[model samples]
Every structure is written in C-alpha cells, then in structure tokens.
Target: MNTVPFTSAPIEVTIGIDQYSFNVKENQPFHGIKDIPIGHVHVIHFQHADNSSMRYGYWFDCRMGNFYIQYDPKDGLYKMMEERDGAKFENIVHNFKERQMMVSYPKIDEDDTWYNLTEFVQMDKIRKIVRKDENQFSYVDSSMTTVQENELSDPAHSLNYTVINFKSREAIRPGHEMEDFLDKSYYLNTVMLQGIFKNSSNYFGELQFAFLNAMFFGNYGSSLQWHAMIELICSSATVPKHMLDKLDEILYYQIKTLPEQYSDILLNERVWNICLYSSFQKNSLHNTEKIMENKYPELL
Candidate 1:
C-alpha cells in the first residue's frame, strides 16, 4: 500500500476558443443518497483550475438582477411575481443577487444583457430551477415531475434533460446506440452485473455520459443524467492517471459527435448549452449556493 500524496496535473478543456481546466482536488463527500452503489465513484472534486477561489466551477461571476417568474406554456407568456413588500428588503439587502427570490425584475430602462443558458438545442425541453421555499428548489419539467427536492441539482442536470438507466440497458439481447452504452459495460463487467468504475480509473465514462446527454433521448426513458454519472466518478471513484489525459478527448468528442448524433435537435430548434457558468452571481454568501441546491426532503 503506497500512500504518498502526489500532485496531479490539470486537464484543460476548450469550448468555442476559450479554455477551461478540471483539476483533481481533495475529495468532497456525498451528503445524502443512502447506500451508494459499488464500483461507482464516491469522492473527489475535478475543480476549476482557472481560479481556485471560484466555487461551482465558474470562471466569471457577473451581477444578476432578480425576479420571480412563472411561465405559461399554453398562453405563451411568463408571469413575474413578487412576495409582500416585507420580503423585498430581505431580498434586496440579503439576497440581492439571488434571481429566484429577488422579489423584483430588471428595470426596462437598463441595458440588455443575455446569458447562454445552454449549448445543446431543444428549446421545448428547457427547464429552469426555481426556489420552492427558503431551503427547497424544483426543476419543473412537468406537472407530474414537479416534486420538491431539498437541494438543487447540478448545472448539467438542471440545464438539460436526457436520461439513461444503467442496469436496465439492453446489451447481450439487452439493447442507442444508447442501449449500446450501458449494455456494453455490463457485458464487459460479466465479472458482475453492476455499474463498475475502472480501478485504474479514468474519465472515459465521464466522456461517455456527457456524449449520451448531448444526444436527444429519442427513446431512452430514464431519469439519470450525466451530472449524476460524473458525481459517481467523484463520489465513489478517483481521477484518471493516464498519460493521454487531455480534456480534448472529452470536448473534441462533444463538438464532433453531438452534431452527428443529435443534429436533428438543432435542425428542429436551433439552440444549445455548453456554457456552465452563469453571468449573474447570486446574493448568497457562498458561491456554490446557486449552483447545486439541497435535495434531501426530510432535512430542514
């Protein structure tokens, strides 16, 4: 058992000419989620190397005006709301940058600024995270799927919505090209039928999961997304130690194959979501307050 701490080099990722880094940092334990599955990654942080001070892996944090909004699909109008005037002071004084509960909207007179919410097109599938209560949030995809969760989901999962179940995938007769992903893994793991991470561990599954998410779900009916998969990599697994550990492998495949795999999504909607950082900063004290929200229902 060799136990010596050695520094790991950073992995750089390029998106539309800008560069980003995913550096291996100290392990961050998963707070909720009882009975973490085996072979899945359980602890680690692929930190944003650009600025160690930046939480939630963002390089830039711009000031964001706040508002409470409710979108009407059948009516095609988004209604903005406000709580009693008593709440406004707390918001303006304490949660000024918090968009969800700001109790105010941007003044019409202010200059317009746009944030890139997503890079993967499919406008109809867009779901925004909203504050349900002081300590609760929800990603409203539909009336049926709007159950409240204590914490917010991550940027990747909240920002997009294509899911694939791991064990249920069909490979041996068990079948996307989507089915090909999870099934093939089970076949290789004939050693067992569980989701297993590489002991020599790597980001191949991370890239694979991201690739799966980039494609349209088409027929893949499940609720697990890339963010959850990558969380497993961090929570149950460790960083890659490969010589060819460049993130170009990750982003390159993203650009090249997303178009090839799901070009029709753009053909139909003409939009996408590669931007992970928000232009607006939340009024909360912790930078991560807005990125991932509380998910445990029993917690207060």
Candidate 2:
C-alpha cells in the first residue's frame, strides 16, 4: 500500500560513460522500506523527524537526494516530487559530512550488451570519516569481543571485496585496465551498522529507539540514506570515532547547542505540504506529520 522510492539498491546497477560503465549503489546498506520482497527493487526515502528537514531530502537532486530501483519495466523509474518552496539539497543545513565522495561512472548490463542508454549514469558516492585541522576523535576496536548475531553469521561478510575486471573490450577507462577499490566495506556489523544500532539504543532508549531505528534506520532498505548522513555527521564531528561510534555523538548532540549545531530535527509542516502525492511525492515529513497528527490530535 505504501510504495516508497528507494534511492539505491544492493544489486549492482550500471551507469553509462561513453562505451564503459560503473556499478553504483548506496554506500550504506539499503534502508527505508516496509513490507517489500527482498531481491526485488524498492525506493529508499528519508522521513524527517519533523517536517522542517523533509524539504531537503524530499526535493532537489543535489547532495542528499532520493534514489530508487530501475529495470522494473512494469514500474518504470520513480519520480521524486520537488518541493518548490522547500529547502534546496545543497543549501539545506546538514548534520555531518563524512560520506561525501561522488562516484561518476557508467554501468554495464551483462544481460544486454546493446542496452546502451548512453548518458544514463548513477550519481552515487561514499562518505568516510576524516580528521580535520580543528579537532580529533577517538577510535576503538572491539573485534575481540565479537560474537554470533544470527545463524550462518558470516563474520567476514564485511571483509569481502569485489575485483572489477572491466573488459578492455568492455573498456571502462581509457588507460586503466580494471578498477578495483574496496567494495561497500561499511556493511560490517563492526563498523557503520553497529554504530547506528548502538547510537539508536542510547538516543531512543531500549524500546522506543529500537523500533524507530530498526524500522527507520536498520536493515538495508530503511536507513541507507540516514546511515550515509550518519557517516557524514560522524566524520565532521569534533570527536570522530569509527563510523558507528561517530554517529552516537552526532545524533545525541544534533540539537545540543543553541545554534542547533548537533541536535535532532523534527519534521516541518509548511514546506513539505506543498504537494502531497505526485509522481516523485516523498513519503517524507508531509506524510509523517499526518501519522503524528492522527495519533495525538493535540500536537497538530
């Protein structure tokens, strides 16, 4: 019933660049979906804590933009609604800036060699924690305390990497024979995912935050974009930690100071209500507001 648009997918999608292609997906595990079948593509969207922030994630294709799955000829590409008066993506105030490297590449379809939709490229990036000149953060390694979370738990799931042997005939880059960078290494429970889970525990408490973070931030389909934001905030924090630990401070302190430098944001009302449900209509603050209002009419 609630069909949200996913910003990225776990399945490798090719982008077009001349005759070559690059695989792109959200750097973080896919997040922000409900009641969807796995392996099938879905849309990943950001629902602001309040309406104020939805404008940024809802409209504009810059910086923190929305993403969805392709290849479903039946569904076609999801169109994200643009909030005319809402905050622009680049202009919107961000909590952090870690996961910020934009990858500009084209994808190749193994199934369709002639499926050349030139200029169709996936604009995705990975944000990582980096130290700044102003301050420093802490780092901890807890691998020794590791334990199994579920059956068939692949401890080394995060350790795996992909070797992109681009066909010279397939021809990725002119000079480079093959491109091999680390695969999405942030999936490790020890790294980004663990940080998000832990941060939510303290921020939302055992029961409340559990569902909020898990349903909102955990799993691949729900929190991928938020996870990306989490990484950005963590990287920019004065006290940087590993991706996971870094977010603890960011979310906890998002609204701490007067300027609201690091304090949590609730959804804003006026901006997001511009267009409720158009093709690109985000299940954003505009939608969340209705849910809150229905529960506690007084809040509205």
Candidate 3:
C-alpha cells in the first residue's frame, strides 16, 4: 500500500467552503459518509449558472459527488443522470486524474460549469424522512420536490424523506446483500446504482470494491469484479468504528436470512472466506489459484 498506480500524486479541488484533496490510489469506501450517522443520509443541493438546480444524497455520492456520473462505454463519454426519468447530461471530461477531475456538462458554458463546481456545498445533513404512508415507500413526491426548492440548509425538507420499497435485480438476490441499508431515502439519490459496469467506476463502486479487495483479491474487470465487490465487505483498515459496526450488523443480517443448510460454509473459514487460505469458492469465476494460473492468468 506504499504507492499505487493510480494514486501517484494528489488531486485537489475546491467545492464551496471546503477544499478536497486526496490520492486516487486503490479503491476506497464511502469516506464522505463515514462521520455521518447510521440509518441516516446527508443531502446536498447545487445549481448551474442557468439557474437549474440539482440535489443528491451525500451518502450515495463519493468524493466530488460522483453521484450518477459514469463511463458510458457506448458513447465513449461520461454521462451524469438524475433518476432515469429526471435530468440527464453528457459529462464532457477535460481530465479525470488522481489529483483532480474536470468535467463540463449541461448547457452551461465552460465558466458556468467551473463556477458550479466551485460553488458546490452541502444543503442539509439534518432531517429524517419518515414514510408518509405505510404502504407507499417510493421516494419521488412533492415533499422531496419541496426540499429541492427550499433554501433550507442544515435542515433537509421533510417531503424528501418519503420511503419507497425497491426491488433489486442483482444476481445475489438483494435481500442478504444490502436491502436493509438501501431501503432508506438514499435510493432516490442513487436511482441507477444497479448498472453492471456503470456503478463500478464511481463512488458506489469504490464502496463495494473496497469490500471485494479486502475479502477477496478482486483484481479482475467486468461483472466478475462487481460480483466480488458486492458479495463481501469490511476492510484492511477501519475507516470508522461506526461504519464497521453497521457493516458487521449487515454481515450477520445476511446470515439470519438464510437457512441452516449454509452451516458448512459458515462454520468453516476455508469454505466461506476464500482469501483466508488460498483456494477459490466453487461456482465463482476462476476461483482457485490453479484455475487462474491455468485459464485466467490476467486476472491473477
């Protein structure tokens, strides 16, 4: 961990009153949400020079609000979107580096886009959205819309707190993976999180990858990379005790959802945690070292 290929230098950029500078080294977790309370999300708002506004959940975004910005391989450019039905833009990247990232999107001119980034600030960290109706949990409504228009800071609008249940189509069957955590309001801020390759390139991807790299030697690319990322968690370093405790709770939460048939894998370290010993879990991509050396050396 001394020096990494991507984090050769420091990238610094100023957003609102705070300046952000960090090495884009190895994959990392959600540092923005580390100090934030559990079961709560921090919401932020900003606008373009044209007066169009945007708000997103800080817990759902990574450094510099990667939010929904992602690599659009089909178009060969980065695209940022708000919910699939909300706003959309083509993020023209001038430079994306370890030290800094420069991107221009929307109809705003270059200077406007620059100022928008400089003016970036947090809108609200306080405010809990309890479900308005027990059966209706979807996050979009006039209340969330009210927060988007309100000049409220430090106090998130109540309308934005509406609860909505979402069905995840992830291969891991969603329940044991992150249902309890993802059931909150952050889902609105992260509408497109399930995209196979899209989510892996940004903050959410970093969060999931941090776990993968920690629990498994996840060095490959493609869905196999994401599959490993979401399948496990915890890390080489504890960012904060609270985060670990919450993740630990989810670790057990996943266990309780399953039947006793998994007792073999759960009871044995070698069977469940492949990285602990040096063998691969069956049915996984090139799971064993021998398998990797023989067929997937590039990943090894």
Candidate 4:
C-alpha cells in the first residue's frame, strides 16, 4: 500500500486565485488495521503581469484510493499526469511564456505504467480543441472531446490540419519521414509576418497582413486576434481588394530584396515568391463586405 497523509475525508486547497476542494477516504489492504492516507500539494508558480500569473500543483486522493497527478504547464494550465499503482515519478522542467506553459518529465516510464495510467485517466477529457484566436473564428466543441486518430487517411488532412499518433513498445521517438520543408517554410513565414504586422505603424496594412496570415495558417489560434483586428478595420471603412494587394506587395517587396531593409533573418526567397505571387491570385482577397453591415458593433 502507498502512503498518503490525510486522516479524514475532505481537504481545502487554495493556491493563488483558484480553489480545488476534494475529499479522500482511508482504504484497506492491511487486513483489519486502519491505514492513514497521505497526500501533498506542491505549487510551482510564475507571475508576468499584475493580473496574469500561472500556478500548477500535484496531489493524491486518499479517499478514492487512487493517485493521479500530472506535470507540465501549457497556456497557463498544467498537463495532467499518468497514474501508477505503486510507482514513483519525477518532473524536470516547468516554465511559462506568453500564453503558454511548458513542462517536461525526466523519469521515463520504462514499463506500460504511464500508458495504463493515461487510459485510466480518460484521454477523451484531455483531448480538446486548442482555441487559436477570437470568438467568431474560434470553435471549440462544448463537449470538450476530440477525435483520437491512429493516423491520417488523406493528404487533405495535412492542409486541413491533422495529427498522427504512434505508440511504441518502448519509450522512443516516433519514426517520421523527412521534415516537410514547404510546410515548415509556410509556418516560418506566418510567424515572421505576424510579428511584423503587430508592430507595423500602418493600421489598415497590419489588419490586411493579419487576415492573410490567418488564412494561410488555416486554423492558427492567433487568427482570432487577427480576425478581431481585421473586423476593426472593416468596421472603419470600405477596403477594396486592389488596395489590399497593393499593401501586400509593399511588404512583399521589402521581404524579398533584403539588402537594404530589415534583416536577412526575415528573408526567405521561397516564402517571398509564394506570398507575393499568391497576393495576385484570387484567393488572397478576403470577403469583408458582410462586416460593413454591423453599424453599432464594438470594435477591438
């Protein structure tokens, strides 16, 4: 039997701004002897702004006679851990960044303990649509369930966003083919464009770039933020497709020939050509005409 530190049923846990209250009970494996249940609540914390802070924890539920704890911080939330019947585990790194938390486990689960624990914990609950951007474009199934896929069946899944899972008999890296250079290039360009758009002095041009970036990235979470900014522009005035193209070309030229302006680090000839050539393509134009009808909507 594993040891837990609680003598009674309910315990009150308060950490930072949130409260997690639960109950525990003593279970028997000692024949007739009453065993004490033990638990621990360890909190690792980080505060970036006065209103923004990330706090995570781990604990044992003695009453239920089960141990389920996880390590990792992701988008201000902790990654749920796998439980084992009677095993010890260790965590290595936990850190917070802008809107994301990252955590790592040092102890490898050599046996099937972690896998079995994850099964017991219900992976369905953990499978969630990571919301990318704003309310309009952001769609999360209220049920909080996800499609557990063994593999992708179609090439369209790649362009449409997909994930593939491969389990191992032992803990090792999943075998993958060569990295997708074209896909990697697109992702890198999206990142670079978004950073520039956010800080760019041109308001309409920034909104234009953000819209295009969101469309290029498909379901990127930041698309909502980008969507909101574009809505602000649409609400302000009518924007023609030609005007959008002109602005895109302006940035594209600067991005392409990097001898005089901006760093070469931001320059990628392939990305520049793709984006510039795509701007001329009909797909580059987004329909904002519908947005003009909202006369009294609040703008971000």
Q: Which candidate wins on TM-score?
A: 1
lDDT of 3 by residue, 80-100 (tens): 333222222112211232233
C-alpha local distance difference test of each model: 0.25, 0.25, 0.26, 0.26
lDDT (10s digit) by residue, model 4, range 1-300: 222221111212221110112211222111110122122111111122322322222222233333322222244332223334433321211112121222122224463322222212211111112323211112221121222321313221221121211122111223422222212322212322233333223333333322222322222322333333322222222234554554444333322222232232223333333332332232442222122113212220
Model 1 error, position 232 (Å): 11
- The digit string of per-residue lDDT tens for model 2 on 24-123 reads 4534333222222222112232322222122111111232322222233353322243223334422321211123233322233352311211111111
How badly does each model clash, as a count of residue pairs? 29, 49, 9, 15
lDDT for each residue of candidate 1 in 1-300, tens digit (9 for 90 to 100): 001011122232111101112223222211111121122111111223443321221111111112232334464322223333545534443432332311122223342111111222121222122223321112222111112121323433343332323333333333244543423433333322144333222234323333332332221211223433332222212223341233223433344433343444322211111111221111211222222222211111
TM-score of every candidate: 0.20, 0.17, 0.18, 0.17
Pick out the ten consecutive residues of candidate 1 with the lowest summed lDDT: 56-65
How high is the lDDT of residue 288 in model 3?
Answer: 32
Instruction: Please give the lDDT score at residue 62 for candidate 2.
Output: 32
Relative to the unseen true structure, what is the C-alpha lDDT of residue 281 in candidate 3, on a scale of 0 to 100?
Answer: 19
True-structure RMSD, every candidate: 22.5, 23.8, 20.2, 21.6
Q: Output the better candidate (1/4) by TM-score.
A: 1
Question: What C-alpha lDDT does candidate 3 achieve relative to the native structure?
Answer: 0.26
Any runs in candidate 1 off by more than 4 Å, and if so which?
A: 1-117, 127-161, 169-224, 228-300
